[PDB]
C-alpha cells in the first residue's frame, strides 16, 4: 500500500474543514447510530503520541477503548469493523473460541510440528489494534496478561527457559456486557461490570451502550437491518462517508507522518477545569477525577489533531477531547451524579453540539416521560 | 616406558611415608586393617610434595591413575603381601582443592576431557546396580577343560563353543564380576542461573562406589572426564558422548 500522489488526495480533503464529521460518520457504515462510539473508535484508530520524557516516565500514546453494554447493540460489529479496517489488527475473545490467546507460551506448533514461542495476541498487535470480545469472561491468567500489557506495554516470559521481555504496544478495544446482562444506571460503571478497578483504570474511553426502548429508534433500526437483509439476498448479490480504502489510506498517512505537538494548549483552562471537576466529584460520594484523566484528554486532543493533520493541537481539538473525556467520565457515574455533573458541566459537554441535537434530546426525554406516565 | 616408570616410582616414594608425618602410611594401614581396597589421597599433599606429579595427575588422569594404583598395590604388598594378594587391583580416590578443575555440570566444558575434575552437584539419576563381568570361566563337560577369558576395561566375545565345537557351560561362581552403576548429577538449583534449564552430566561408578550416593542428594564427585565411543560402524558423526568416570564420591 505504498502509493504516491495520494498524499495530494489525502491533503485534498484534509482541508475540507469538516473532515472530522466525515470520518466519524465513516466508521462501521453497517451500524446505525452510536455516533459517540464511532467518534471514540476513530480517535483510538488515529491514536495519540507516545512520549517518554528522559527515559524514566513511559507514557503510552494509545487510546484504549472499552464498550460495555447490554446485548443486541452491535458491539462485536464495531470490533469486527476495526479488525477489517485497521492494519496489524487482531481479534480475540475472552472465551477460548479465538485462534490466538492473550497469554504467551512455548510449544510445538500442531501443524508445523516445530517448537516455537507462541507470543500472546497482544504481542502480535505490537504496533496495531487488539480487539478483545467478551472482556468480562477471561481467565485469571488472561486477566493478568491484559493487566501487564496495558500497564507496562510489554510481556515477560519465563515459561521453559526463555527469560525474556518482549514489548506489546497495542491499543486495546474491548467489548463487554454488564453484570446480570443489563446495565443499570442506578449503579456506577465500575460495579456493574465483572472487571476489577485496576483494569478499568487503564482504559481511556468508556462507552456505555444502553438498549432503551424507543419507538422511533426501534423503527429506524428495523428498517436498516431489514433493508440489509433485502439487499444481501443471494439472488440480488449529515455528510458523505469516505470510502473505506481511502479512509485507511488517510489513517496510514496520518498515523505515520503527522505528529501533533501541544504547544498551544491553554494550561489555564485545563487547570481550572480539572480543579472544578475534582471539587465537584469529591463534593459527592462519586468516583473522582484523577491525573490519568488529564493524560487521556491530552492523548485524545493529540489524536483529534492527527485526524486533521494540524501538527499543532488547536483550541477546538482540546475542547473536543475534553467533551469526549467528560462524556465518558460522567456516563461512568451513577444516575444522580450523572445529572449532577451534566448540569454542573453542561457547557463543556455541549461543545460542537448544535442546538438541534440538545433540543431533540430534551423533547425525546419529555415525550418518554409522558409515555411512561400514560402506560403505568 | 620411562615416563610410566618415573610416575610409579614417584607415587611409591610418596606413599612411602615414614620420614615424613607418616600420614599416608597410616592411611594404608587403615585401609588394610578395616578390609577395604580403595585409598583416598588429598591432592593438596601431591601439590605440597611434588607439583609436577600433581599437575600430571590432574591433566592426564587415566595413565597417571593407573601408575598411582600400581604403586599403591606394590606398597600394600610390601607392608603386607597376604592382604595384597586378596584383591586383584587397589583403587584410588582423590580430594582436596582442585584449582580450576573444581566446577559444576554447567561449567564442565570439553576442555577438561582426560583431566581430573571435582564436580559438585545434585544427584538426579541412580541406575540399578549391575554386575559387569571382568573375567569369565567356562567348563567343557566333554573335554574336562576349564578355560579362563579376561575382559579388559574398554570403557567382548563371550565364548560358548570349544575349539572342536564342544559346548561350554559358564562357571558363574568362579567368574569374576564387578558391580557397576551409572548416575546422572545436576548443578545445584541454588547456584544455577535462575533463567535457563538445569545442566547435568553422567557419572560411572565401579565397585566401592556403586551406592555411595542416593537419588536426590547433594554430592561431590571426583573423577576423570572422557569421551565414550559409538558402536562399530562405517560412518560416524564428530559428536562424542562424555561421562565422568568417578574415582571418589562423597556426601557434601
Ligand atoms: N445499531 C445497529 N445497527 C445495525 N445493526 C445492528 C445494530 N445493533 C444491532 N444490530 C444487529 O443486531 C444483531 C445483534 O448484534 P450483535 O450480534 O453484534 O450483538 P452484540 O452487541 O455483539 O451482543 P453480545 O454482547 O450478546 O455479543 C446483529 O445482526 C447486528 O447486525
Ligand atoms: Mg458481542
UniProtKB/Swiss-Prot annotation, chain A:
Major localization class: nucleus
Disorder this protein is connected to according to its UniProt record: Deafness, autosomal dominant, 70: A form of non-syndromic sensorineural hearing loss. Sensorineural deafness results from damage to the neural receptors of the inner ear, the nerve pathways to the brain, or the area of the brain that receives sound information. DFNA70 is characterized by slowly progressive, postlingual hearing impairment.
Processing after translation: Phosphorylation by the CDC7-DBF4 complex during G1/S phase is required for the initiation of DNA replication.
Additional free-text comment from the UniProt record: Early fractionation of eukaryotic MCM proteins yielded a variety of dimeric, trimeric and tetrameric complexes with unclear biological significance. Specifically a MCM467 subcomplex is shown to have in vitro helicase activity which is inhibited by the MCM2 subunit. The MCM2-7 hexamer is the proposed physiological active complex.
Binding site for ADP: 76-77
Keyword RNA-binding tagged: no
Oligomer and partners: Component of the MCM2-7 complex. The complex forms a toroidal hexameric ring with the proposed subunit order MCM2-MCM6-MCM4-MCM7-MCM3-MCM5. Component of the CMG helicase complex, a hexameric ring of related MCM2-7 subunits stabilized by CDC45 and the tetrameric GINS complex. Interacts with DBF4. Interacts with KAT7. May interact with MCM10. Component of the replisome complex composed of at least DONSON, MCM2, MCM7, PCNA and TICRR. Forms a co-chaperone complex with DNAJC9 and histone H3.3-H4 heterodimers.
Any one Gene Ontology BP term: regulation of DNA-templated DNA replication initiation
Location relative to the cell: Nucleus; Chromosome
Residues the record lists as Phosphoserine modifications: 30
Family recorded in the similarity comment: Belongs to the MCM family.
Motif (Arginine finger): 201-204
UniProt keyword NAD, yes or no: no
Physiological role: Acts as a component of the MCM2-7 complex (MCM complex) which is the replicative helicase essential for 'once per cell cycle' DNA replication initiation and elongation in eukaryotic cells. Core component of CDC45-MCM-GINS (CMG) helicase, the molecular machine that unwinds template DNA during replication, and around which the replisome is built.
GO CC annotation terms, alphabetical: chromatin; chromosome, telomeric region; cilium; CMG complex; cytoplasm; cytosol; intracellular membrane-bounded organelle; MCM complex
Protein name: DNA replication licensing factor MCM2
Keyword annotations of the record: Acetylation, ATP-binding, Cell cycle, Chromosome, Deafness, Disease variant, DNA replication, DNA-binding, Helicase, Hydrolase, Isopeptide bond, Metal-binding, Non-syndromic deafness, Nucleotide-binding, Nucleus, Phosphoprotein, Ubl conjugation, Zinc, Zinc-finger
Span of domain MCM: 19-225
GO molecular function: ATP binding; ATP hydrolysis activity; DNA binding; DNA helicase activity; DNA replication origin binding; enzyme binding; histone binding; single-stranded DNA binding
Curated annotation (Swiss-Prot), chain B:
Transmembrane segments: none
Subcellular location: Nucleus; Chromosome
Modified residues (Phosphoserine): 152
Post-translational modification remark: Acetylated by MCM3AP. O-glycosylated (O-GlcNAcylated), in a cell cycle-dependent manner.
Function summary: Acts as a component of the MCM2-7 complex (MCM complex) which is the replicative helicase essential for 'once per cell cycle' DNA replication initiation and elongation in eukaryotic cells. Core component of CDC45-MCM-GINS (CMG) helicase, the molecular machine that unwinds template DNA during replication, and around which the replisome is built.
Family named by the database record: Belongs to the MCM family.
Name of the protein described by the UniProt record: DNA replication licensing factor MCM3
Residues of the full protein shown: 9 to 268 of 808
Amino acid at each position: 500500500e505504498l502509493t504516491d500522489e495520494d498524499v495530494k488526495m489525502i491533503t485534498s480533503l484534509s482541508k475540507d474543514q469538516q473532515i472530522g464529521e466525515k470520518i466519524f460518520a465513516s466508521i462501521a457504515p453497517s451500524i446505525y447510530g452510536h455516533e459517540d462510539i464511532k467518534r471514540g473508535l476513530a480517535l483510538a484508530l488515529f491514536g495519540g503520541e507516545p512520549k517518554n520524557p528522559g527515559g524514566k516516565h513511559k507514557v503510552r500514546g494509545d487510546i484504549n477503548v472499552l464498550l460495555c453494554g447490554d446485548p443486541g447493540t452491535a458491539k462485536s460489529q464495531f470490533l469486527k469493523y476495526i479488525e477489517k479496517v485497521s492494519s496489524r489488527a487482531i481479534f480475540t475473545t475472552g472465551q477460548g473460541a479465538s485462534a490466538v490467546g492473550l497469554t504467551a507460551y512455548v510449544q510445538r506448533h500442531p501443524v508445523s510440528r516445530e517448537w516455537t514461542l507462541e507470543a500472546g495476541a497482544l504481542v502480535l498487535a505490537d504496533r496495531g489494534v487488539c480487539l478483545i470480545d467478551e472482556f468480562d469472561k477471561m481467565n485469571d491468567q488472561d486477566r493478568t496478561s491484559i493487566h501487564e500489557a496495558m500497564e507496562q506495554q510489554s510481556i515477560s516470559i519465563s515459561k521453559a527457559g526463555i527469560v525474556t521481555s518482549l514489548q506489546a504496544r497495542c491499543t486495546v478495544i474491548a467489548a463487554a456486557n454488564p453484570i446480570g446482562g443489563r446495565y443499570d444506571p442506578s449503579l456506577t460503571f465500575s460495579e456493574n461490570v465483572d472487571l476489577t478497578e485496576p483494569i478499568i483504570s487503564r482504559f481511556d474511553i468508556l462507552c456505555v451502550v444502553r438498549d432503551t426502548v424507543d419507538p422511533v429508534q426501534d423503527e429506524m433500526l428495523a428498517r436498516f437491518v431489514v433493508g440489509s437483509h433485502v439487499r444481501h439476498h443471494p439472488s440480488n448479490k449529515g455528510v458523505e462517508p469516505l470510502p473505506q480504502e481511502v479512509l485507511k489510506k488517510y489513517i496510514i498517512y496520518a498515523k505515520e507522518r503527522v505528529h501533533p505537538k501541544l504547544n498551544q494548549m491553554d494550561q489555564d483552562k485545563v487547570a481550572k477545569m480539572y480543579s472544578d471537576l475534582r471539587k465537584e466529584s469529591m463534593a459527592t460520594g462519586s468516583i473522582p477525577i484523577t491525573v490519568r484523566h488529564i493524560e487521556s484528554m491530552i492523548r485524545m486532543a493529540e489524536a483529534h489533531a492527527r485526524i486533521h493533520l494540524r501538527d499543532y493541537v488547536i483550541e477546538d481539538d482540546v475542547n473536543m477531547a475534553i467533551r469526549v473525556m467528560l462524556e465518558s467520565f460522567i456516563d461512568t457515574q451513577k444516575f444522580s451524579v450523572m445529572r449532577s455533573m451534566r448540569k454542573t458541566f453542561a457547557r463543556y459537554l455541549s461543545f460542537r453540539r448544535d442546538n438541534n441535537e440538545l433540543l431533540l434530546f430534551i423533547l425525546k426525554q419529555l415525550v418518554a416521560e409522558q409515555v411512561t406516565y400514560q402506560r403505568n | 616406558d620411562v615416563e610410566l616408570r618415573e610416575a610409579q616410582r614417584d607415587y611409591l616414594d610418596f606413599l612411602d611415608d615414614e620420614e615424613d608425618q607418616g600420614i599416608y602410611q597410616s592411611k594404608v594401614r587403615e585401609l588394610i586393617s578395616d578390609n577395604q581396597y580403595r585409598l583416598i589421597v588429598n591432592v593438596n599433599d601431591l601439590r605440597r610434595k611434588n607439583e609436577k606429579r600433581a599437575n600430571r595427575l590432574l591433566n592426564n588422569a587415566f595413565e597417571e591413575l593407573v601408575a598411582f594404583q600400581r604403586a599403591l598395590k606394590d606398597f600394600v604388598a610390601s607392608i603386607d603381601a597376604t592382604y595384597a594378594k586378596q584383591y586383584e587391583e587397589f583403587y584410588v580416590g582423590l580430594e582436596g582443592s582442585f584449582g580450576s578443575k573444581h566446577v559444576s555440570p554447567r561449567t564442565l566444558t570439553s576442555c577438561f576431557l582426560s583431566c581430573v575434575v571435582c564436580v559438585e552437584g545434585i544427584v538426579t539419576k541412580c541406575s540399578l546396580v549391575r554386575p559387569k563381568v571382568v573375567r569369565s570361566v567356562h567348563y567343557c563337560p566333554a573335554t574336562k577343560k576349564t578355560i579362563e577369558r579376561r575382559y579388559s576395561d574398554l570403557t567382548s566375545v563371550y565364548p560358548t563353543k570349544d575349539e572342536e565345537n564342544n559346548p561350554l557351560e559358564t562357571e558363574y561362581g568362579l567368574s569374576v564380576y564387578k558391580d557397576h552403576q551409572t548416575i546422572t548429577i545436576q548443578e545445584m538449583p541454588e547456584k544455577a542461573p535462575a533463567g535457563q534449564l538445569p545442566r547435568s552430566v553422567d557419572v560411572i561408578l565401579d565397585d566401592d562406589l556403586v551406592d555411595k550416593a542416593k537419588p536426590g542428594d547433594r554430592v561431590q564427585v571426583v573423577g576423570t572426564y572422557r569421551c565414550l565411543p559409538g558402536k562399530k560402524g562405517g560412518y560416524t558423526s564428530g559428536t562424542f558422548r562424555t561421562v565422568l568416570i568417578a574415582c571418589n564420591v562423597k556426601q557434601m
